[PDB]
Design an enzyme around this catalytic site. Structure first.
Site, PDB file in Angstrom:
ATOM      1  N   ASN A 105     -59.792   4.083 -34.011  1.00 49.07           N
ATOM      2  CA  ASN A 105     -59.869   4.960 -32.853  1.00 49.07           C
ATOM      3  C   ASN A 105     -59.315   6.356 -33.136  1.00 49.07           C
ATOM      4  OD1 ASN A 105     -60.828   2.677 -31.608  1.00 49.07           O
ATOM      5  ND2 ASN A 105     -59.229   2.590 -30.006  1.00 49.07           N
ATOM      6  N   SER A 140     -61.520   9.022 -24.144  1.00 50.34           N
ATOM      7  CA  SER A 140     -61.407   8.095 -23.022  1.00 50.34           C
ATOM      8  C   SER A 140     -60.497   8.693 -21.953  1.00 50.34           C
ATOM      9  CB  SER A 140     -60.785   6.766 -23.445  1.00 50.34           C
ATOM     10  OG  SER A 140     -60.411   5.956 -22.347  1.00 50.34           O
ATOM     11  N   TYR A 186     -54.377   0.815 -27.450  1.00 49.97           N
ATOM     12  CA  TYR A 186     -55.655   1.502 -27.207  1.00 49.97           C
ATOM     13  C   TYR A 186     -55.453   2.849 -26.532  1.00 49.97           C
ATOM     14  CZ  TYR A 186     -60.213   2.550 -25.336  1.00 49.97           C
ATOM     15  OH  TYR A 186     -61.388   3.195 -24.999  1.00 49.97           O
ATOM     16  N   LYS A 190     -56.213   6.822 -27.813  1.00 51.66           N
ATOM     17  CA  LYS A 190     -57.118   7.778 -27.167  1.00 51.66           C
ATOM     18  C   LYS A 190     -56.386   9.032 -26.737  1.00 51.66           C
ATOM     19  CE  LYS A 190     -61.094   5.510 -27.434  1.00 51.66           C
ATOM     20  NZ  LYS A 190     -62.280   6.135 -28.116  1.00 51.66           N
TER      21      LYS A 190
END
Ligand SMILES: NC(=O)c1c[n+]([C@@H]2O[C@H](COP(=O)([O-])OP(=O)(O)OC[C@H]3O[C@@H](n4cnc5c(N)ncnc54)[C@H](O)[C@@H]3O)[C@@H](O)[C@H]2O)ccc1[C@@H]1CCCCC1=O
Ligand SMILES: NC(=O)c1c[n+]([C@@H]2O[C@H](COP(=O)([O-])OP(=O)(O)OC[C@H]3O[C@@H](n4cnc5c(N)ncnc54)[C@H](O)[C@@H]3O)[C@@H](O)[C@H]2O)ccc1[C@@H]1CCCCC1=O
Ligand SMILES: [Ca+2]
Ligand SMILES: [Ca+2]
Lengths: 254, 254
Positions: free
Chosen positions: A107, A138, A151, A155
């Site tokens: 990511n 995101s 996560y 982002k």
């Protein structure tokens, strides 16, 4: 940006958001649409070609966790074929907070490395023509889903990185903007691993609330590309396209 | 939080900011002060002990880029000695945007992994007592130094991660807050590698503007620990301590 006759590389074009974006991109009559993804999907490629047979669609297997030298080698092959690339779209991502290292590698690190590699070909300081980078980040990079903190932190990193790229455009000749979907329903049905299993039901709980479809997202994604606004932070949520104003909490003064 | 008689683990206690923070910590009459750092510094350890001989100071070699299982093994050794740990301070960082992978591994992955490891001992769901985590992030996690975009993005990640930890405290029993220095002068004289050498003079250019000393920083760092505010985003800049309000751009509704 009029996408007619442009050459676009899209990393992760064949995922849920990616494929609906790609359907809209090929309607825009690209010259070359070069799809880089970890796994092949020959049926998707054929669907795309059927939407607009004029577009030349090519595919290369690509895993964003390879070293930067390997990315450079692949990009060289693409530049030697196409000669010019107008836009790079970095769209790879996973969500699995049981996979801490791999989340960060795909990511964040991988997006930075693909970017660093293409700058070899584009940087105006090395005689390159400049370019444009669209990074799929995101909304969680603005405000986390705290039940998937790894996560969300990955982002936040690429929201930051993209803002910084845009501010370097006077030096490098490469402009950039972020594309930040909110919760977007695709053809897939998901369940997520939360960090240390703090919340086993994240996917279900998110879908209790208003969301958008991948078709809506893909439509607003191409609209954002067409706006071609260096330094934009685009929110694609609830079916709309909205530029966000980043809060100035601190200034380096440089 | 009254630090008297508490047990504190400080990763990277012996760096420029770390050592001046550590001088103030030992004045606060800890029971045990356990310093984890990549390289030994026996003179610093002795200086600290001389400030307050009552504090029991121990050192372990620790590199935050080891796997989480290795961190767990070391923490087990510490918990078996101390029995309880009140506060973990995660302070490791590098700035070198020629070292993309290692920047991310130290500044973001490593902090997440140390955190994940200590949760084995603290998580209230496993019968643990809860705990407190103080993460050294950076003002660049709010607004980048865009000439070191990888560093800055790594710090945006851990600002996010820390906010998320704080929101999980009802589940895990572990509270958290970020400590975000602005530009802080230490005994060291630095020069920095910027990404793709966009700006070779970042250190010099930063120091053209008002900054603070590591002593000021260290004083406000201990003041922030004493305030013990879950979810605080502390800015330590220009010699003051200020909590930041994070902008709500998006809400998951979960
Ligand atoms: N669908 C959403 O609602 C959503 C999606 N994203 C991101 O949007 C991008 C596309 O996601 P998607 O279409 O929903 O997921 P999907 O799993 O369908 O697509 C992932 C794409 O990344 C590719 N990929 C994965 N690993 C690699 C690798 N190592 N090398 C090269 N390619 C790889 C994969 O082959 C595929 O093309 C990802 O970066 C997502 O993280 C951003 C925002 C939201 C997320 C949803 C989850 C909770 C929080 C949200 O904000
Ligand atoms: N001094 C500052 O002005 C400053 C410092 N920071 C951060 O504050 C923390 C301390 O920085 P410092 O004292 O200035 O730097 P210094 O280099 O003196 O200390 C680094 C500390 O991290 C440790 N360390 C490095 N790698 C590892 C590893 N692999 N495993 C375990 N320990 C490791 C090292 O041994 C030492 O204890 C770091 O996280 C910095 O990134 C945050 C904000 C600012 C930065 C300054 C640079 C430009 C942008 C800023 O915002
Ligand atoms: Ca057209
Ligand atoms: Ca006291």
């Amino acid at each position: 940006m009029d996408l007619t006759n442009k050459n676009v590389i899209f990393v992760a074009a064949l995922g849920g958001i990616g494929l609906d974006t790609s359907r809209e991109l090929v309607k825009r009559n690209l010259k070359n649409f070069v799809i880089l993804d970890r796994v092949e999907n020959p049926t998707a490629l054929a669907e795309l070609k059927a939407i607009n047979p004029k577009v030349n669609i090519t595919f290369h297997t690509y895993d964003v966790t390879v070293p930067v030298a390997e990315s450079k080698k692949l990009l060289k092959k693409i530049f030697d074929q196409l000669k010019t690339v107008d836009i790079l779209i970095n769209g790879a991502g996973i969500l699995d907070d049981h996979q801490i290292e791999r989340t960060i590698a795909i990511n964040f690190t991988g997006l930075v490395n693909t970017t660093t590699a293409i700058l070899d070909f584009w940087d105006k300081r090395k005689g390159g023509p400049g370019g444009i980078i669209a990074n799929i980040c995101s909304v969680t990079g603005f405000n986390a889903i705290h039940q998937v903190p790894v996560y969300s932190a990955s982002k936040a990193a690429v929201v930051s990185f993209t803002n910084s790229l845009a501010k370097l455009a006077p030096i490098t000749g490469v402009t950039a903007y972020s594309i930040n979907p909110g919760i977007t329903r695709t053809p897939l049905v998901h369940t997520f691993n939360s960090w240390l299993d703090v919340e086993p039901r994240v996917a279900e709980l998110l879908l209790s609330h208003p969301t958008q479809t991948s078709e809506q997202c893909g439509q607003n994604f191409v609209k954002a590309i067409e706006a071609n606004k260096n330094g934009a932070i685009w929110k694609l949520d609830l079916g709309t396209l909205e530029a966000i104003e980043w809060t100035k909490h601190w200034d380096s003064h440089i």
